From a paper:
The membrane domain of the mycobacterial ATP synthase is embedded in the IPM, with the catalytic F1-domain of the enzyme extending into the bacterial cytoplasm and attached to the membrane domain by a central stalk and a peripheral stalk (PS). As do other ATP synthases in eubacteria, chloroplasts, and mitochondria, the enzyme couples a proton-motive force (pmf) across the IPM generated by respiration to the synthesis in the F1-domain of the enzyme of ATP from adenosine diphosphate (ADP) and phosphate by a mechanical rotary mechanism. The mycobacterial rotor consists of a membrane-bound ring of nine c-subunits, attached to an elongated central stalk, made of single copies of the γ- and ε-subunits. The mycobacterial PS is made of two proteins, bδ and b′.
Numbering used by the authors:
A (entry chain H): 3 to 7, 19 to 56, 59 to 80, 107 to 120
B (entry chain G): 53 to 66, 219 to 234
C (entry chain a): 10 to 247
D (entry chain d): 1 to 59
E (entry chain O), N (entry chain Q): 2 to 86
F (entry chain b): 22 to 82
G (entry chain N), H (entry chain M), I (entry chain L), J (entry chain T), K (entry chain S), L (entry chain P), ...: 3 to 86
Write the structure that this text describes.
């Protein structure tokens, strides 16, 4: 598994596009989209409205350091 | 994070390589 | 029967053959260009609102000067500025005059054009390309010396690729000429092909092709000028 | 003759396309450039007058 | 036997067809690649739209040339066939 | 019927083009460069004049 | 056999080569340019307006070459040079 | 040797070349455009609606040439130009 | 030389060209579409389910071409146009 | 001469073209799909199991075409259509 | 004129086509797969251990086609079908 | 049949092949190098002067091959080796 | 004309096809593998020491193909199968 | 009735044309790809201009080699044609 700051999957939208992180994903630094949403699936999936975050995938850990409204709607499912 | 961006990016803002979704310079700027 | 080549008004002088049609087309283009130049010289103004001719001429000058300055200092190669620009306009006019409806029947079903773009003649393109070739090679010799310049061109960026460099140099003129040639030559043929259609069907494909050929001629003039400036900058360094 | 008429109609179509779609934008570009240079000249004259007024007032 | 010029012209037509086909393939693919670069560059930043058309039209000039040069030679084989006897 | 062989016109065209070049060298490009340079000089002088007028009225007080 | 038969067979094969090459070039170039355009539009919707400017230029060149072939093939097939 | 035999053989060769080139171009261009579309859909799920429009355009062009080839192949073999 | 022999040889070569071009186009187009699909799934494993709808479309536009060519091969080799 | 010899030579050339096209398409398509698979495995090793599914489809979609060509090449060289 | 001579010439042309297509496909596919592998190793120096698994699969799928073509090429020149 | 007729027909076909290959190679290589140059210009306004030195090295090679081919075409066509 | 003449002409054409295909494959595959190596070295200058290991493999798997073709080309030209 | 040497020479010329066409395609495209990589690398790291040449040329060294090998064999086909009677 991977340490999200334990989970199984981390779905997120970056400036490049939608990105999903699995346990051994390569190291990565990305900028979350202005209205980004984070879905952490662990052995129910937690949905977070992240605004202006930064994704940082490491060998072991994944750190997630009108746009805000859209992020809220996406997190709560209205999109 | 900023140190990792700077190490693999141009310093001109006014083992395993980190992957950067957009180019390193834009992330460094933001 | 398509009648490729087949220059008209061919005459002879000093044991040399001259295609009269090509000379006439080139003369008409030169007359148009000189008329534009003299209209500018008459209406050139630094204080009043510029006329359309001045706008066009200064747009061309600004363009060519920008590429020159980017590639090589204008002070280093000022003489490149006129040459480049004139080349452009020359070629441009030589192509755009082809849009005029000067195609008629040849009394045997073969289309004949009163005016044919001179670039469709190998002599015109070869003259322009060889003049540019000699010009920038002379500029390179002057900048680097009669003995130094050949050494630089043969050795090029990397000396171990000396043979390729030589070939590359020989590729500069012909690639400049033939390219232009083909760009116009094909058009000269293509319109003739469209002439095989009946008028009530010939009008449309001819219209489409000539509308596109306008842009083709513009792009070819621009490419010739840009590559001339490029070669000048390449041959004047260090 | 026949092909001459066909190519004449083709040139008429070309001229119609030009006048209808290409002439307006290029004419607008030329007008914009003329207005810009005229405005620059007007600003230059107005700045000269402004300096004259400032010098007269000061002295 | 058969008229030599017939064989000459058949070979000339085959060669010209090969020349034009190769030129068309090269021109189309190269122009597509250059246009891909141009469109992607404009997408990445609109303000660069002015500075891209200069290198781009150099590329086309270097690319499209290969087409028309061949075209010229194609005509040479087809309209004035070398060794036509 | 080879149309690729150079002809006598290679010289004739080379003459006409040269003539055009001459005109463009001495009656198009020099005047246009002068007009442009005068225009950038005008713009710079206008900007400097505005700043100088502001500074000079300020110093008048 | 009639020499014109040989001339026409050669002309047909040459025209087939011309059209095949033109089709390959047109298809692949249009596909590449359209890939660029589709990716650009996917990245940001706003660019849809501006991207169409270079795209039609690209096509404008690519397609043009194809149609040139489309004409020369006719020259080969309908009015065969040196038919004699 | 029947002249028509040589004419038909040449026409069949040319039509085969035309279809070969057309299929190569159509297949590769459709593949490239579809690659762009698939990447866009994967990265931007919402962009799908605004991606089918440009994609179709590309496909259109890519198909156009191919279908054009079709016609001429049908011309080459069924009604061979220059047939004796 | 029986005229039918020449016609059949030409038709067989034409069919071979048709299939060669079709196979090249189909293989490369399917490969490129698959590259897009695999890259999309690797970047976003959950997206797999929603990436088949575009992918298939692309494959369609590829396979169709190939199969169309295949059909015409039959005409060339089994009911040869212009065969005497 | 024997017409069957001409027909056989045409069949051999056609089958050679079929195999050439099939080999080009299969090799390039498999290379592209494998490039995608290698890149995806490099990016997300834990997605390996999820990536072989589309990969096998694309390869399955590519090799299929190639083998279809075999199914028609053998015919050409073993049951030659129109052979006398 | 010996019919076997014509059949052998056709077989040689077919074998040349087979091997040319196989070489093109194998070379380009291997190049693409190796490009993927080299980029993956460049990003992850320690990833090679796993990247060699899919890579060898890709090559396995590519060379396979090549060596099938070679086999059939040997069936063209050494035991020519239809050679009487 | 005149030996020179067949020899020079083969020479013309060979020169056509030389130019087809040269055109394909030059066009595609120049397109690729220009794609690199355009990308570099797009993401670095000031890199132009720096990127031209490598660019025209690449072109310096690409064009070279093309023109070498062209040279040999002349030898193939205007002074055919083995002509008699 | 002697049967050996036709057989040797076919052998020469087949060898030419083999060499052309092999050269295309080798050149393009080596170019792609290079592109990968240059990109990797640009990204990680120190990685060169390791990057040459996979690269060679790729080049190997490419060059082999080419050289294999070479052998068969000789087999076509110097000891022609089926020669009479 | 026909000279066998004529047929052999025509076949040799077609074979040499194929050799050169394939060699030119391979050389042009491979050099274009390698140069694309070199240009991208120099754009990313201007300081790497001298470092990237060692791998770049190696690639070219392979690419051109294949091409020139073809060239040699073409000289074999057309000038000293194997199988000439």
């Amino acid at each position: 598994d991977l340490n999200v700051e334990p989970a199984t999957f981390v779905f997120t939208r970056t400036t490049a596009g939608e990105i999903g992180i699995l346990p051994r994903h390569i190291p990565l630094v990305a900028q979350l989209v202005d209205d980004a949403m984070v879905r952490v699936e662990r052995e129910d999936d937690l949905r977070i409205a992240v605004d202006g975050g930064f994704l940082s995938v490491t060998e072991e850990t994944v750190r997630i350091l009108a746009a805000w409204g859209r992020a809220r709607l996406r997190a709560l499912g209205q999109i | 994070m900023l140190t990792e961006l700077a190490g693999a990016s141009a310093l001109d803002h006014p083992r395993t390589l980190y992957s950067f979704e957009p180019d390193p310079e834009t992330l460094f700027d933001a | 029967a398509i009648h490729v080549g087949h220059h008209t008004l061919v005459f002879e002088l000093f044991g040399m053959t001259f295609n009269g049609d090509t000379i006439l087309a080139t003369a008409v283009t030169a007359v148009i260009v000189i008329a534009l130049a003299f209209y500018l010289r008459a209406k050139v103004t630094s204080t009043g609102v510029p006329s359309g001719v001045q706008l066009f001429w200064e747009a061309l000058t600004i363009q060519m000067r920008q590429q020159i300055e980017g590639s090589i200092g204008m002070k280093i190669a000022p003489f490149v500025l006129p040459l480049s620009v004139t080349i452009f306009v020359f070629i441009l006019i030589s192509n755009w005059l082809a849009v005029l409806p000067l195609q008629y029947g040849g009394a045997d079903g073969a289309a004949a054009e009163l005016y044919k773009a001179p670039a469709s003649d190998i002599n015109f393109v070869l003259a322009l390309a060889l003049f540019v070739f000699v010009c920038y090679h002379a500029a390179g010799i002057w900048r680097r010396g009669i003995v130094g310049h050949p050494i630089k061109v043969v050795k090029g960026h990397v000396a171990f690729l000396a043979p390729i460099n030589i070939v590359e140099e020989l590729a500069k003129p012909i690639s400049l000429a033939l390219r232009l040639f083909g760009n116009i030559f094909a058009g000269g043929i293509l319109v003739a092909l469209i002439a095989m259609f009946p008028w009530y069907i010939q009008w449309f494909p001819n219209a489409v092709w000539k509308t596109f050929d306008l842009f083709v001629g513009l792009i070819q003039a621009f490419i010739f000028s840009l590559l001339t400036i490029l070669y000048f900058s390449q041959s004047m360094e260090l | 003759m026949s092909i001459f008429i066909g190519q004449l109609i083709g040139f008429a179509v070309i001229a119609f396309i030009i006048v209808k779609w290409v002439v307006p934008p290029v004419r607008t570009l030329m007008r914009n450039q003329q207005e810009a240079v005229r405005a620059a000249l007007a600003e230059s004259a107005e700045a000269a007058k402004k300096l004259a007024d400032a010098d007269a007032m000061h002295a | 036997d058969l008229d030599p010029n017939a064989i000459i012209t058949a070979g000339a037509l085959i060669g010209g067809g090969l020349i034009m086909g190769g030129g068309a393939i090269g021109a189309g693919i190269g122009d597509g690649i250059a246009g891909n670069a141009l469109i992607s560059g404009i997408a990445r930043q609109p303000e660069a739209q002015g500075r891209l058309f200069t290198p781009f039209f150099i590329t086309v000039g270097l690319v499209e040339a290969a087409y028309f040069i061949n075209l010229a030679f194609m005509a040479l084989f087809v309209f004035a066939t070398p060794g036509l006897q | 019927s080879n149309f690729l062989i150079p002809n006598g016109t290679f010289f004739a065209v080379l003459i006409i083009f040269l003539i055009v070049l001459g005109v463009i060298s001495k009656w198009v490009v020099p005047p246009i460069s002068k007009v442009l340079a005068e225009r950038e000089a005008m713009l710079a002088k206008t900007a400097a004049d505005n700043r100088k007028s502001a500074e000079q009225v300020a110093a008048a007080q």
